[PDB]
Each structure stands twice: as C-alpha cells, then as structure tokens.
Amino acid sequence: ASVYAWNRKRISNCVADYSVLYNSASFSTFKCYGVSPTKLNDLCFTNVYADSFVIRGDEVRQIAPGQTGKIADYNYKLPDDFTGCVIAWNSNNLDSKVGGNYNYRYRLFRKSNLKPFERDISTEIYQAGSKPCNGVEGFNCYFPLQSYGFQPTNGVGYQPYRVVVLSFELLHAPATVCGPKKSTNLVKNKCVNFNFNGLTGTGVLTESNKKFLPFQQFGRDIADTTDAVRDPQTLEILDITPCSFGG
Amino acid sequence: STIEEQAKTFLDKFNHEAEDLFYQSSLASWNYNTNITEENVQNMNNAGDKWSAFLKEQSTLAQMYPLQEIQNLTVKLQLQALQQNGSSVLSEDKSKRLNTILNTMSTIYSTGKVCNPDNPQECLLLEPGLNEIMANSLDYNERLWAWESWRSEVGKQLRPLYEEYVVLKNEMARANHYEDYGDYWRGDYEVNGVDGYDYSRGQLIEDVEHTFEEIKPLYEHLHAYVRAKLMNAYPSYISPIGCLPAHLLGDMWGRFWTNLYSLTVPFGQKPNIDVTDAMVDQAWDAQRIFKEAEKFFVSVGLPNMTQGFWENSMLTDPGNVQKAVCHPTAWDLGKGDFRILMCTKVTMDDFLTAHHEMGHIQYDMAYAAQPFLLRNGANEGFHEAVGEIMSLSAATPKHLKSIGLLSPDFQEDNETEINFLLKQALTIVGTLPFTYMLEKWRWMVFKGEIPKDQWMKKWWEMKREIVGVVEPVPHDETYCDPASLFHVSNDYSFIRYYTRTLYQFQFQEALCQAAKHEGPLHKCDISNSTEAGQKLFNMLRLGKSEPWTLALENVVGAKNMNVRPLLNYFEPLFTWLKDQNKNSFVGWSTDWSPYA
Ligand SMILES: *[C@@H]1O[C@H](CO)[C@@H](O[C@@H]2O[C@H](CO)[C@@H](O)[C@H](O)[C@H]2NC(C)=O)[C@H](O)[C@H]1NC(C)=O
Ligand SMILES: *[C@@H]1O[C@H](CO)[C@@H](O)[C@H](O)[C@H]1NC(C)=O
Ligand SMILES: *[C@@H]1O[C@H](CO)[C@@H](O)[C@H](O)[C@H]1NC(C)=O
C-alpha cells in the first residue's frame, strides 16, 4: 500500500529464521539497530510488527530512528528506542510504470507531524494560509496527497523502493516467536553431557524398558534424581546412569 | 500563517507538478530527435501545448504574493521566475504581429536565395555548395558578389521589418517597466542580493569595452600579419595603410579567420598535432571514446557516469529509417534521466566535441539536487565555458601521451607551438572585436540614439575601426546588413559568447594552478589531479541557487572581470609577432576603400 496507508501486520506464535533473510544478497538495504542480525536468531520477543509500503528511492533516508522528513513527518514516524530492523529494495522492475504509477501517493500537507506508529488517513484539503478552504481548491488550497510519476527510466534515485520495517515487542505475555533450536544427533553408551529440552546433566544414556504414560516427559525415581528421559524428536524412553567414579 | 509560508507552499505545489510534465515533454523531445517521424511531431505539439497551458496559469497566479518580504533570497528568486509578465503583458495585436514578424525573419534568413547571372533560374542557399564556395576560396570577385547579393536579398526587405521588431520588442521592455530591451537581456548578469555582490545592467555595457582594448595590442599585430600574408597572397587589393574587406575574412560576418588561416599560416613545415591515424590505428570506437573521456574526468575528479545513459543516450550512426538528427546536445530530461546526442566519430576534433557535450552532461548532473527553477548555472556562459574546459584539456600533447594517443617518442618545439597558437588565436581572439562590436551595436540600436539611416552605414564605419572591414561596396540605406545574421532576427542575446571565452580562460588558468603544471597556459594539462575535480565540483554544485558574482569567487577571487588569461595564453604568439612584422607598421587605416 501507499506510504500514507502503510500496511501494519502482526505476527506471533511461529518460528522465525532471520538468517535466510540476512543471507539474502538480492535485498538492497538491510539495516539493524536493536542487535546484530546474527544474534537475532538466538534471542526472541513475544510478537512482531511489520510496516510495509513503497516510497521513492531518494526518500529511504527518512525511515530511520529519530529521522524527520515529509514522509517521516506526515506519513509515518519512528521513535529513537526502536528495536528490530529495516529492509528496503528497488521496485522499478515492478512498480515503475511506462504509463506512470500514479496510484502511490504521499501526504505533503498536514497541520502537525505524525506521531510514531500513527497514521493520518484523512484526505482533507489543506489551508496553507489564513482563509478557509470550502471544497474546490482556491488560493491557499493544495491537494494533501501528491501522486508519483514513476517511469521505467528515472535513474536510481527516482525508482520506487519497497520498505518493510520490522519491530519486535516483548510484552509481559510469554514469548511466542523465537528462532529454531538446531537439534543434533544422538550417541549412546558413552559418558556425555546432555541438555534435553532445557534439562541438562551428565551421564551415560542407555536403552530402557520403562512405560511412560503418553503425557510425561521425564521420570525421576526418588530423592528427586532424574532417571529416564524421552527424546523429543523420536519419542522413546531412554535411561541415564552416572559416569563412573571412585577412590 | 504569514504570506511567506503560503508562497513556499504554492511554489512547492507548482514545481511538483511541473517536474513530471517537463519530464514528459523532454522525453517527447528526445523521442522525436532520436526518431525523426511524423507521429513524434504530433507528440511534440500535444506535449508543448499542454506544458504551455500548464505553465502560463501558474505564472499568471504569481501576483497575489507580495514578493518583497521573503527573508530567504533563494525562495525570493524562485518566486521571481513565476512573477514575470513575459509575453502576455502586451496587447494581443502587437504580440501576434511580433510573433509573425519573428516567423518571417526566421523563414527569410533560412531561405537565403541568390542566383548567379549565368543561371538565374536556379538559385542556391547558405547550404553547402555556394556557401562552401564563398567560404572556401581564394578570390575577390565571387565572394564580393555573394556578399552584395546576400545583403541585397536579406537586408533589402528586412530594414522596416527589423525596425518594427526593435521598436516593438523595446515596447515590450517598457511593458516590463524597462526603458530598453538591452536592460532585459542584461538582467541575467544582474543581481540585487548579497551586498557587495550586487551588479547593475549598466556597468556591464562599459566593462565589455573595458576588457576589449587590452587584447587589441595583440589584435593589431595579428591584423598586421594577416595584412602581410594578404599582400603575399592578394596582389595589391589591400592598402598598406588600410585593412581587408568583409568577403576576405573567411566568414561573411568576420566571425572567424579559420578559412583565412591557410593564407596566414605561420610555418607549414610542422603541421597541427593530428592523432587521427593513431586514433583509428588503436581501434578506439565511440564507445571507447566515451569510456576514455569518463576515465580522464575521473582522473580529473568528476565521478562515474550514471547508468541508463549507456542505454538512453545515442552516440553514432543514425543510419536506417530510424533517423536521428545528431546536432551535439546534452539532455537533462529531469527525474534523474540524462541523454547525449551526437554523431561521434573517430577524430580528435570529434573527440573534443564529445568531451564538450559530456562535460555539459556532467554539469547537468552537478546541479541535480536543485529544484526545477534552480537546475541551471550561475549564468548561461558558465555551462559553455565548462564544456570547452576539457575540450582544451583533452587535446594537450601531455594528455595525449599519458593515455597513449601520441607516439611514446613524440616531442614538440617552437614551430608547432607557434602554428597551434596562431591557429587557435585566429578563432579565439579574432572574434572578440567582432563579438564586442556586434553586442554594442545591438545595445545602441535597442537604445535608439542613432537614427534610422545611421544603422548599416554606421555599423560599417564602426566595423572599419573595430574589426577592420573596408567597404568594397558600402550598404547605406536600402540594405539591412545585420539583418543578414542569424543572431539578430531570432532574439538572441549575444554577450554570453563574449563572456564565455573569458570565463573559460579564467577557469582553465585557475585549474592550471590547481593541477600542478609548469610552463605556458596553452601547454597545460589538468588530468590525474583529483583536487582539480574537487574544486570543479565546488564550483558546479552551487547551480542557480547562488548569484553568479558569488560563484565567481572560488575559482577566481576577482568578482569583477579580468582579461589576464587572454593575454597570458597567446603570449608566445604576441612575442613572435612583435619580431615578425618589424618592417610593417601595425594597425590599419579607416579611409581607403577597394573602389577608391
Ligand atoms: C520429526 O521429524 C523427523 C523428520 O521427518 C521425523 O523422522 C521421521 O519419521 C518418520 C515417521 O515415522 C519415519 O518414517 C522416518 O524414518 C523418520 N526419519 C528419521 C528418523 O530420520 C520424526 O518422526 C518427527 N517427529 C515426530 C513426528 O514426532
Ligand atoms: C505586469 O504589467 C502590468 C501592467 O502595468 C503591471 O500592472 C504588473 O505589475 C506587471 N507585473 C509585475 C510582476 O510587475
Ligand atoms: C566507476 O565504476 C567502476 C566499476 O564499478 C569502479 O572500478 C570505479 O572505481 C568507479 N569510479 C568512480 C570514480 O566511482
């Protein structure tokens, strides 16, 4: 959608692989402000918000933490404590039109600068002077929404660029979106250390004949010492024995 | 809200919609010139009429803003362009008569028609042929006859026509509250902005001749050399006291002596430095020509060329039904789109022409950030001066050997230096007196102190002293000689060319200092000096957003006008001519005539 009608999307309760998007050389601009993109795969938040639109190629500077501009002031504003990243890429091959892609419009005239995460949807004719504007444009009347004359031949700076701004919110509710875990393979009959689904400890893992009822995860016998565990990826009952020691 | 913010909003609203429509019109123009076709003619009609019908209204609504309180002088100058009466201030009848009379002057000049007496049924034009014959010849009769006929069929019926044009254009000047149209022309070189940087229309007139007499010490010596070579070539047809007629100047208006250069060759043993054999032998095409020009500019300091230019711009071979006029042009269509248009050829002269046009293109990108009303130069002469700067810089022998155009073992001496300097001065300084006299004559025919009769006879009697043209057949009343000139009938300001040579001389001099070169200015190369390119960009990026007087403060610190580079460039020629025409006396007398 156009910049004055920026598309806001909410995503939660899924695994996100930020690496592949990071490992994408076909994307023009990838600027991260919260943390390093490589580290992003590890930590996680409770939900994600995406602000997607298309602007002019020369206006990409406007979308930045604590940045001002016509697009930044009257179409979409940002705070300085932004967490997340910004992705941009040219769309002249798609959005630029030989007949002119005048569908895309932006708010040039507005009484006040737009607030962060706020949209101005009114198409009110603006008053640049002191006289009121009643319907048809007069002296101090100019259309708030200027269209775009994108052409296939307009140089790099004038091409339409798609921009998606990704923010991660970490409300007190439990985290819903997190990166993958990268489970390894399995070994047996050797003193190793394990971290099955967050339950850690050392020992030797052998086969067992116990019968876990189909909703338990692990079993301890007495004095609260874990004996059996159930492998998340194969669903079988293992057994744990401490590694040998003695005087 | 104060009116000034309303002015800013209105200007932004105007230029936003103006940029796209101007881009559409420029795209149509480039399509028509790249594709000579009937349909593109109607495209030009339907784009130009739309652009005019859009711009005229915006200029018309530029009156309710009181443009006298804007604190930002840049915004004031931006609003100044729209707050211009233009051509609609006049009444309908006078304006349409003026347009018609401009049309008839243009048609008459483009249709110069004279028949030789042996073939009165088939005339010839200024097209190659008769014009070539009267421009490339060693004779006295045919050139004189052609000059007389041209003045008697373009100047005979254009005297009242040009009188009406002058009086009506000056009346339109009063319609703009100007007592003369010369003031309207000089308004380009006039700013009332920064105190101490301001200028007036009047002062330019006097300073044009204030810098004209300083080159005349060299002009007299060059005229004496030309007269001596005429004595050795034209037998007893030029008086030793006097000077040469109009038809013996190589050009029918005395513009350049290049056609007369062969007569006044200094020394033919050492010819001009021509790399055409090497240029072809290296197998460098127009694409390689443009690439090498780009590399030379990068060494100078200007950045890489934008993409699409390799695709949108045309370079050579109009060829087939896909016709394309290739008059060397640079096209800034706006919206970050640029094109260049030539029949670029494998030649050193064509190499320099391509350098000129691509330097124009580079300056076109230089003011990219400025709005539509500021995407220009400080003055119209700076663009052409820049465009000739690298043309000067791309032909120097050091530059040729640096990129391997000349042979690795090529050396120059005094003879080739003298020949090159004389040939160059036959074009550069040989037109400055003619340029000055034409500009001043136009100023005094606009002012109107001289009566109707003192128009062509006065022009000739002044050309006798300034350019040095005797009258084999004088033109008193029934002929209009200046009317037989291209830039007299199309409303063309002509002082721009006069200032362009001085400006480019100053810029080349300053770059020569800020390029680490030693020796004479004509042997100066400014390649492989990135600081020179940085200074160039500092000059260029200002654009129309800054006054021309302010612009003339970094490259040269003299906001006024100087003539030092003109004297310094042709210094070896002057010192050679001092000892060359030792026996003959310099100067010419304005009393002898070929008829008596
Ligand atoms: C987790 O995914 C793996 C990968 O597909 C599943 O492993 C396969 O499961 C099927 C179903 O029995 C077997 O036929 C394949 O031989 C398994 N491939 C292996 C072990 O490499 C695994 O079943 C999934 N976990 C579930 C469904 O709980
Ligand atoms: C244009 O000419 C008219 C005619 O006198 C004048 O009233 C008007 O002020 C002029 N425009 C400007 C901008 O001066
Ligand atoms: C121009 O582009 C080429 C290829 O990308 C590069 O090698 C060169 O350094 C560039 N020159 C400038 C001045 O940017």
Side-chain angles (χ1 to χ4, degrees):
Chain A
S2 177
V3 58
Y4 65 91
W6 42 274
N7 292 147
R8 175 58 158 256
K9 184 71 183 302
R10 179 182 88 78
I11 295 190
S12 59
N13 320 99
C14 55
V15 61
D17 184 275
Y18 312 103
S19 75
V20 56
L21 323 176
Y22 181 74
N23 307 347
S24 185
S26 306
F27 277 33
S28 304
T29 305
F30 182 82
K31 204 162 302 172
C32 284
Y33 317 105
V35 290
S36 66
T38 68
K39 184 242 187 173
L40 275 170
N41 306 295
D42 308 337
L43 79 165
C44 59
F45 295 67
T46 190
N47 45 3
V48 186
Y49 285 110
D51 286 313
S52 55
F53 46 76
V54 173
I55 62 166
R56 274 188 58 234
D58 284 317
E59 306 167 356
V60 290
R61 61 95 184 170
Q62 293 213 20
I63 310 153
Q67 186 58 254
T68 181
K70 281 295 173 196
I71 295 304
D73 297 327
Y74 310 139
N75 296 259
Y76 193 66
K77 193 89 208 84
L78 299 179
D80 310 72
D81 54 356
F82 183 81
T83 176
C85 304
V86 175
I87 292 170
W89 69 97
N90 195 342
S91 71
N92 50 359
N93 46 357
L94 294 174
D95 282 336
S96 81
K97 205 153 90 198
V98 54
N101 194 0
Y102 298 99
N103 281 296
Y104 271 89
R105 299 188 298 159
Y106 81 96
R107 313 181 69 89
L108 170 68
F109 288 101
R110 185 175 139 72
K111 192 175 293 311
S112 55
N113 285 15
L114 267 192
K115 272 73 183 172
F117 313 108
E118 194 210 15
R119 192 187 292 110
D120 189 12
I121 64 170
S122 179
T123 69
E124 184 80 21
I125 180 70
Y126 190 78
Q127 170 188 179
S130 60
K131 76 171 189 67
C133 197
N134 188 9
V136 185
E137 295 197 6
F139 173 39
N140 271 289
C141 304
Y142 318 97
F143 207 75
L145 319 172
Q146 334 302 303
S147 83
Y148 281 149
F150 291 130
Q151 316 300 329
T153 74
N154 281 159
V156 188
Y158 206 71
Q159 302 315 319
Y161 288 14
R162 317 195 176 223
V163 178
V164 164
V165 193
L166 212 62
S167 159
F168 313 122
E169 187 209 7
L170 193 148
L171 200 69
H172 294 89
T176 73
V177 298
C178 300
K181 301 289 97 176
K182 278 77 53 178
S183 178
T184 67
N185 56 359
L186 181 69
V187 298
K188 297 210 243 183
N189 310 113
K190 279 158 59 186
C191 173
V192 309
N193 60 6
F194 46 78
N195 59 359
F196 285 167
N197 214 335
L199 162 61
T200 63
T202 70
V204 57
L205 285 73
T206 74
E207 206 57 38
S208 65
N209 47 356
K210 288 182 184 294
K211 307 282 182 61
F212 272 10
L213 190 153
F215 82 91
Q216 290 90 17
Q217 300 318 111
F218 52 94
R220 58 192 64 163
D221 53 1
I222 200 164
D224 303 348
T225 49
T226 62
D227 280 337
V229 288
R230 153 167 288 169
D231 45 354
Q233 270 176 0
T234 314
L235 269 50
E236 62 177 338
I237 298 91
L238 263 56
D239 198 330
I240 285 154
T241 300
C243 307
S244 311
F245 68 98
Chain B
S1 70
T2 186
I3 52 175
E4 196 275 331
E5 325 304 317
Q6 328 187 12
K8 290 183 179 179
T9 54
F10 186 61
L11 285 161
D12 305 352
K13 177 75 155 172
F14 152 75
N15 58 50
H16 181 74
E17 53 196 358
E19 280 172 21
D20 199 0
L21 200 60
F22 154 76
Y23 178 77
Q24 281 197 304
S25 175
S26 300
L27 185 44
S29 300
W30 178 259
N31 275 311
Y32 174 53
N33 270 323
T34 313
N35 189 355
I36 305 168
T37 178
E38 59 278 8
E39 198 262 328
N40 265 323
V41 176
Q42 289 94 27
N43 307 153
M44 281 325 317
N45 312 144
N46 300 319
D49 63 357
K50 160 173 59 174
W51 172 257
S52 184
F54 151 76
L55 196 75
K56 198 47 200 167
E57 279 73 339
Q58 311 307 313
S59 178
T60 315
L61 280 72
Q63 275 73 241
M64 80 280 278
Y65 283 117
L67 186 56
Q68 65 256 19
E69 59 90 23
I70 291 183
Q71 54 89 32
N72 192 355
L73 278 191
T74 301
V75 176
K76 181 188 270 152
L77 194 140
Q78 179 192 357
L79 191 39
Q80 186 70 79
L82 281 179
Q83 301 213 348
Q84 302 297 104
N85 258 323
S87 56
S88 79
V89 59
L90 291 184
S91 188
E92 56 91 20
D93 51 356
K94 301 231 282 189
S95 173
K96 73 179 305 291
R97 182 69 181 88
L98 204 44
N99 300 316
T100 301
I101 203 167
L102 274 295
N103 293 132
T104 188
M105 291 146 197
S106 160
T107 55
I108 283 173
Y109 193 79
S110 78
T111 48
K113 202 76 77 170
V114 294
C115 288
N116 221 24
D118 61 342
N119 50 3
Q121 58 264 33
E122 191 267 330
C123 288
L124 301 163
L125 282 72
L126 213 56
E127 58 97 24
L130 174 64
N131 184 34
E132 182 63 36
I133 285 295
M134 65 182 179
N136 190 352
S137 74
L138 202 42
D139 210 356
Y140 201 85
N141 55 7
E142 71 162 10
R143 282 171 151 246
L144 175 51
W145 155 84
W147 173 62
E148 178 59 30
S149 66
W150 205 266
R151 304 305 155 90
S152 70
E153 65 94 16
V154 177
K156 185 177 180 181
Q157 53 271 56
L158 265 295
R159 166 79 168 279
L161 267 68
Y162 192 59
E163 156 185 353
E164 192 173 6
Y165 167 73
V166 162
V167 67
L168 186 53
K169 197 56 73 177
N170 289 16
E171 183 266 330
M172 193 273 282
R174 280 83 66 192
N176 295 114
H177 312 299
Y178 286 167
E179 73 267 17
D180 192 18
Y181 205 69
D183 278 323
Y184 193 95
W185 283 354
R186 294 188 302 276
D188 52 5
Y189 293 100
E190 172 193 45
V191 64
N192 316 124
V194 185
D195 295 342
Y197 281 169
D198 314 300
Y199 203 66
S200 55
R201 304 168 305 270
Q203 216 163 350
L204 184 64
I205 293 177
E206 291 84 4
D207 194 78
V208 168
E209 71 259 12
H210 279 140
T211 182
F212 155 74
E213 294 280 336
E214 283 79 1
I215 69 164
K216 205 182 279 188
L218 170 63
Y219 190 62
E220 296 153 22
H221 288 68
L222 275 163
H223 187 289
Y225 185 86
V226 166
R227 215 194 70 232
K229 281 288 201 296
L230 288 191
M231 301 315 208
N232 287 313
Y234 281 136
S236 66
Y237 288 164
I238 301 102
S239 66
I241 42 173
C243 60
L244 74 164
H247 56 276
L248 295 192
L249 299 155
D251 212 338
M252 271 55 78
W253 305 263
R255 313 187 78 188
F256 301 122
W257 292 350
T258 318
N259 290 126
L260 191 64
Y261 156 72
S262 305
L263 279 77
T264 79
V265 59
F267 293 104
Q269 272 308 106
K270 288 213 72 70
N272 191 4
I273 306 306
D274 180 43
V275 295
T276 304
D277 54 352
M279 187 66 204
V280 171
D281 193 15
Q282 285 172 333
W284 290 15
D285 63 341
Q287 319 312 107
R288 176 60 166 271
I289 280 171
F290 271 63
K291 277 195 180 302
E292 294 269 358
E294 180 191 90
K295 297 185 320 195
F296 150 72
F297 262 85
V298 162
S299 84
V300 161
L302 279 195
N304 266 347
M305 186 66 204
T306 181
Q307 211 165 8
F309 167 80
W310 305 89
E311 295 178 353
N312 313 135
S313 70
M314 71 66 78
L315 304 190
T316 318
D317 214 334
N320 51 358
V321 184
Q322 189 51 254
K323 296 301 209 315
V325 165
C326 58
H327 165 66
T329 42
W331 293 62
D332 176 21
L333 318 189
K335 278 171 166 231
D337 195 359
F338 295 87
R339 289 92 194 272
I340 191 166
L341 184 138
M342 273 88 78
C343 291
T344 318
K345 293 172 174 291
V346 188
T347 309
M348 201 45 257
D349 300 339
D350 287 307
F351 207 82
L352 292 191
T353 315
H355 268 254
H356 188 106
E357 308 319 302
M358 183 278 288
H360 275 326
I361 281 286
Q362 273 294 309
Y363 189 72
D364 280 337
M365 283 74 74
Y367 50 72
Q370 288 308 317
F372 179 78
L373 312 183
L374 291 176
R375 274 169 226 141
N376 287 110
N379 45 29
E380 43 187 357
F382 280 174
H383 200 40
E384 276 301 317
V386 163
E388 302 277 13
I389 280 161
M390 71 305 297
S391 308
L392 271 177
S393 166
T396 57
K398 166 195 306 303
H399 179 252
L400 305 193
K401 206 188 278 192
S402 75
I403 70 174
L405 294 175
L406 283 171
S407 81
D409 48 2
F410 204 85
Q411 324 294 328
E412 71 272 60
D413 65 352
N414 51 23
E415 185 174 1
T416 177
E417 173 179 356
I418 283 161
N419 183 18
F420 174 76
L421 214 63
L422 188 135
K423 177 179 170 60
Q424 194 176 1
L426 280 177
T427 303
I428 287 186
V429 65
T431 185
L432 309 181
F434 157 72
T435 302
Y436 155 67
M437 61 79 71
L438 170 61
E439 179 64 38
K440 185 153 280 303
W441 176 92
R442 290 189 95 180
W443 272 333
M444 319 305 198
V445 65
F446 279 171
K447 209 155 292 185
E449 64 175 2
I450 54 173
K452 208 57 58 182
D453 58 356
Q454 313 287 95
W455 268 13
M456 280 63 56
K457 45 177 299 298
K458 183 72 177 177
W459 161 276
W460 287 129
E461 71 92 20
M462 281 295 337
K463 192 186 272 294
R464 286 159 77 124
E465 301 102 14
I466 297 193
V467 183
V469 170
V470 296
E471 303 297 301
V473 294
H475 296 285
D476 270 12
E477 202 73 29
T478 188
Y479 310 119
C480 201
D481 296 330
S484 87
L485 182 47
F486 192 81
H487 314 282
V488 170
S489 75
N490 312 138
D491 200 13
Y492 272 46
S493 65
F494 186 75
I495 198 59
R496 176 216 286 130
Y497 315 97
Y498 195 62
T499 55
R500 180 254 318 279
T501 301
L502 277 81
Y503 284 157
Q504 67 185 359
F505 266 55
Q506 305 149 227
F507 308 150
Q508 164 83 350
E509 185 269 331
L511 265 53
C512 191
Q513 279 71 239
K516 300 294 187 291
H517 155 267
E518 67 288 335
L521 185 62
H522 73 273
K523 274 211 299 174
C524 190
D525 196 20
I526 52 181
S527 179
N528 282 317
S529 181
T530 175
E531 64 274 12
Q534 184 38 244
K535 174 183 267 291
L536 283 164
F537 178 52
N538 285 339
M539 186 66 204
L540 303 201
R541 207 251 297 162
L542 299 195
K544 195 177 267 186
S545 175
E546 314 294 338
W548 64 294
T549 56
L550 157 67
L552 272 164
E553 262 311 305
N554 302 322
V555 170
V556 292
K559 37 200 154 175
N560 71 330
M561 321 305 198
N562 73 320
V563 75
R564 181 58 47 80
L566 265 171
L567 319 180
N568 287 351
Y569 195 97
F570 303 121
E571 174 77 42
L573 190 58
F574 190 66
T575 196
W576 179 63
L577 274 186
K578 289 194 287 289
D579 75 277
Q580 178 45 243
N581 48 37
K582 189 186 178 181
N583 53 1
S584 165
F585 79 110
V586 298
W588 53 102
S589 81
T590 58
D591 54 349
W592 165 85
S593 66
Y595 57 82

